[PDB]
């Protein structure tokens, strides 16, 4: 017994996705970046399906559904990598078959970006982040993505309120020792925003340099305004 929204988000959680880096291809920054962008493309399909499970998300206009996903997609991807990484030390679990350490981060040109993701990991390890809290924060990051393009501002605010309420009710029942735990969880969202912004900018620059092939969906979310 905690909160039905939390229960519902847990059963909506997508299945594990394999990176499947091409074993015939020599190891290189281009291979690593190709593997990551391919993995992101596939995860984005599953993120779109998952969003439809979030109560009220479907009742927004298609424009408003697109705007929230265009602003939040990379925060959702990053929160996944952070959650998969909590039991690891200085490694990022992009996928069960794609665990990046510091050297692989240097070789891929991702040392600054992966260091920032590890800063999110460190904070969530010290807070002992629970799956329930992770799925609820992923939903809040979607609802709270601060798109410039929102048509129904009140509806988007009501989706924020519903999810925030779910987090607060979860924390009130599960963590009576810390009555400010919900707030402390919200206080982690600035770092996710910062990290997501840097990731989008880094991958947009790789897109511009033209050396890494990228699929249609990944490209469409990189090109969003």
């Amino acid at each position: 017994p905690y909160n039905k929204i939390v229960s519902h988000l847990l059963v909506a959680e997508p299945e594990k996705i394999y990176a499947m880096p091409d074993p015939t291809v020599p190891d290189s920054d281009i291979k690593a970046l190709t593997t990551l962008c391919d993995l992101a493309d596939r995860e984005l399909v599953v993120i779109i399906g998952w969003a439809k499970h979030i109560p009220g998300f479907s009742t927004l206009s298609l424009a408003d559904q697109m705007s929230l996903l265009q602003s939040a997609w990379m925060e959702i991807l990053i929160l996944g990598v952070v959650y998969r990484s909590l039991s690891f030390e200085d490694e990022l679990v992009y996928a069960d078959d794609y665990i990046m350490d510091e050297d692989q981060s240097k070789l891929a040109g991702l040392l600054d970006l992966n260091n920032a993701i590890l800063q999110l990991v460190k904070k969530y390890k010290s807070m002992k982040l629970e799956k329930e809290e992770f799925v609820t924060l992923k939903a809040i990051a979607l609802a709270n993505s601060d798109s410039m393009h929102i048509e129904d501002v009140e509806a988007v605010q009501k989706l924020q309120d519903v999810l925030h309420e779910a987090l607060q009710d979860y924390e009130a029942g599960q963590h009576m020792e810390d009555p400010r735990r919900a707030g402390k969880m919200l206080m982690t969202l600035p770092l996710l925003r910062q990290t997501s912004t840097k990731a989008v900018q880094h991958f947009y620059n790789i897109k511009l340099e033209g050396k890494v092939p990228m699929h249609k969906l990944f490209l469409e979310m990189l090109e969003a305004k």
């Binding site: 779109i48 439809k52 298609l62 559904q65 697109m66 265009q70 969906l217 469409e220």
Partner: peptide, 12 residues
Amino acid sequence: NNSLLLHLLKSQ
């Protein structure tokens, strides 16, 4: 318009 994001949001 012909957006893959839109098409995926509209389907199933």
